[PDB]
Amino acid sequence: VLSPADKTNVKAAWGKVGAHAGEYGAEALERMFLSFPTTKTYFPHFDLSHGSAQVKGHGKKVADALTNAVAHVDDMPNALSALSDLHAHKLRVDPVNFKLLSHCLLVTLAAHLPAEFTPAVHASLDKFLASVSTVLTSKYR
Amino acid sequence: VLSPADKTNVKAAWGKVGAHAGEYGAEALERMFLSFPTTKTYFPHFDLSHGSAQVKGHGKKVADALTNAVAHVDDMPNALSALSDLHAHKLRVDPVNFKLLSHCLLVTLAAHLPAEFTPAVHASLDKFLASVSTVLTSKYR
Amino acid sequence: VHLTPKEKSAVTALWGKVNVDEVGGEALGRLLVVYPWTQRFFESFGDLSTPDAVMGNPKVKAHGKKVLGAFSDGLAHLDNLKGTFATLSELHCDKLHVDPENFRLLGNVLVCVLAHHFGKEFTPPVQAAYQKVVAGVANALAHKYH
Amino acid sequence: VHLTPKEKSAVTALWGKVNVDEVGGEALGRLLVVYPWTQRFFESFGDLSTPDAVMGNPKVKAHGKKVLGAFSDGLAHLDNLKGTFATLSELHCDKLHVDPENFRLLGNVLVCVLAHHFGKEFTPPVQAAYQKVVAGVANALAHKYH
Numbered sequence A, B: 001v002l003s004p005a006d007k008t009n010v011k012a013a014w015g016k017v018g019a020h021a022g023e024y025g026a027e028a029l030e031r032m033f034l035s036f037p038t039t040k041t042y043f044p045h046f047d048l049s050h051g052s053a054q055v056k057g058h059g060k061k062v063a064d065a066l067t068n069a070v071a072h073v074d075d076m077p078n079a080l081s082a083l084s085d086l087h088a089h090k091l092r093v094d095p096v097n098f099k100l101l102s103h104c105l106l107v108t109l110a111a112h113l114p115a116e117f118t119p120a121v122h123a124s125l126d127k128f129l130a131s132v133s134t135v136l137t138s139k140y141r
Numbered sequence C, D: 001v002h003l004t005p006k007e008k009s010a011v012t013a014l015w016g017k018v019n020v021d022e023v024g025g026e027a028l029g030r031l032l033v034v035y036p037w038t039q040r041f042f043e044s045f046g047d048l049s050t051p052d053a054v055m056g057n058p059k060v061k062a063h064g065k066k067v068l069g070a071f072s073d074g075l076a077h078l079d080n081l082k083g084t085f086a087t088l089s090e091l092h093c094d095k096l097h098v099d100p101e102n103f104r105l106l107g108n109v110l111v112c113v114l115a116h117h118f119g120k121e122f123t124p125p126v127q128a129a130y131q132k133v134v135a136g137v138a139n140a141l142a143h144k145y146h
């Protein structure tokens, strides 16, 4: 469960993403596919070598889907219900993979936004990613 | 996050828990302490002996804290602030221990209320305890 | 691992009373219900869109009972669990790629079914003994991961 | 543990640039902040009350070095990791009962710390290789739980 300070950090740091949204989401996914190859089995219909325009694209999609949640933070079950329906009923994504992407995002963020990736911020982003992780892997229709 | 059905289930399974809240909370604690000995270190001051009055009485406290959680299933972070402070701020309890007690609570309920312990309700209680576990291990201040 | 001689007798007296036709199936069925993502590994199985469908699904019953079979061999080989499940491990780990946290989940769901069948007979010390067994099996199935 | 030769060169190159003086501290430090329950294990350390507190503590920072050397230890000869950490396994598992999930968390916060210090130099291929390493180290630390 997020504190007020946590929502504050998440919107202040994620807000530094901006135009780079697409790039970061893309990179985070790339990091997951290379670091944790089993996660590629959720993406058979994807071209997955470096520079796939598709991974780049469904990189902006996560990043923006993520953009979704930072402002509707107080109610993601609502804002993300389509995304839950997708991840929890269709694909049945094992929660472990959410922790992997989450970790990969923290890495992408720590590599690109150093002045921003403070320990307190790090803590808040992990919770945030954990909480959107719970939303997307639960069937609550 | 819980569904409508899940919500009514925690209510309808826990409705059958009599004034046996004491017995069951106690039995869950006893099951945790014997099955997972490391849990004992969170209670060095307690008498953890077979038949421990102190444990039976703590069973009661756990079971009534759970009661209150049922009572505000939609406002847990609100209703549970004091205990978060206790478990997350003071005690610093490793979340794995909540998985262990949750499991033992499930076994206990399975053992005593088999009629209520359907697959669908088991599913719901598990989500319910994880959610109270998340509330109890999160710093939300 | 090492159960005590006491624990060993008690698990080897409770087990002799298991319904080797329902428990397995009840455990797996519960796994697919309580942790729905496990449904992804059973595509060839059939209808699993409701709890009711799952438990009465004949494939779930049948495979579930193969599972109990595997736990049975486990209880008979508490000494080297690592080798007894060496083939099952490569199967789940290198061919199946099942995340090992899921082995722990099945193990615990199996304990829940035991509590459910045996009620008060599934005492806390009997459970403690069974937790050591399920942990052991889990760590054997995840052995080809380390 | 099986890094490719190019992965091995890549991690060795990068480790060579690590500040074996601070990053250990930043690794341990972030662990205490991001998973605040791990502070239970360090009460003899002092003021872990605030992020700035933990972060800026000669205690957390002294200890970190130990941590880094254990990793460098591991980095050196990556074909017997079980051996090098055997004492630390006993220590953490047997002595301090640290839940092994915690080991993975620290390895991952280390990856975070490395990405922090190297930015664009911490490429996806290089991370992928450090993930093999921290995974290797974690599984060794938790082996006495086996």
Ligand code: HEM
Pocket: A039, A042, A043, A058, A061, A062, A063, A065, A066, A083, A086, A087, A091, A093, A097, A098, A101, A132, A133, A136
């Ligand atoms: C925070 C985590 C995630 C977020 C925010 C997220 C967000 C999204 C979004 C916005 C889509 C849209 C796809 C579409 O529009 O069709 C999507 C699809 C998808 N996700 Fe994720 N997703 C997340 C995690 C994951 C994880 C961990 C996996 C598995 C490793 C996964 C596998 C997939 C797959 C297979 C699709 C369908 C792609 C398609 O058919 O377009 N997702 N997600």
Ligand code: HEM
Pocket: B039, B042, B043, B061, B062, B064, B065, B066, B083, B086, B087, B091, B093, B097, B098, B101, B132, B133, B136
């Ligand atoms: C759902 C999980 C839990 C609930 C609902 C719960 C509920 C409670 C309640 C009602 C108290 C009363 C404190 C007081 O006397 O004012 C308490 C205290 C405590 N809990 Fe928990 N507890 C839970 C889980 C755990 C776990 C998993 C651990 C450790 C393994 C733990 C360790 C403690 C300790 C050490 C205390 C101090 C009790 C005292 O000094 O009175 N708790 N809890």
Ligand code: HEM
Pocket: C038, C041, C042, C044, C066, C067, C070, C071, C088, C092, C096, C098, C102, C103, C106, C107, C137, C138, C141
């Ligand atoms: C203690 C834990 C477990 C035991 C003892 C066990 C045992 C078995 C056994 C005996 C088989 C038969 C393989 C064959 O037909 O040759 C099997 C296969 C299989 N297991 Fe499990 N298993 C466990 C955990 C899991 C978990 C947690 C999952 C998924 C979440 C899983 C997914 C599968 C699948 C998909 C198959 C093959 C099914 C098929 O043939 O279509 N297993 N396992």
Ligand code: HEM
Pocket: D038, D041, D042, D044, D066, D067, D070, D071, D088, D091, D092, D096, D098, D102, D103, D104, D106, D107, D137, D138, D141
């Ligand atoms: C994950 C990789 C880890 C490595 C490489 C590592 C390494 C070390 C080393 C070298 C020591 C020195 C102990 C001695 O020489 O007596 C130590 C001690 C210790 N570790 Fe870790 N450790 C790890 C994980 C953890 C985790 C996750 C925790 C707790 C959350 C932990 C808690 C402790 C404690 C409490 C001590 C003793 C502190 C003292 O001397 O007072 N360790 N570890």
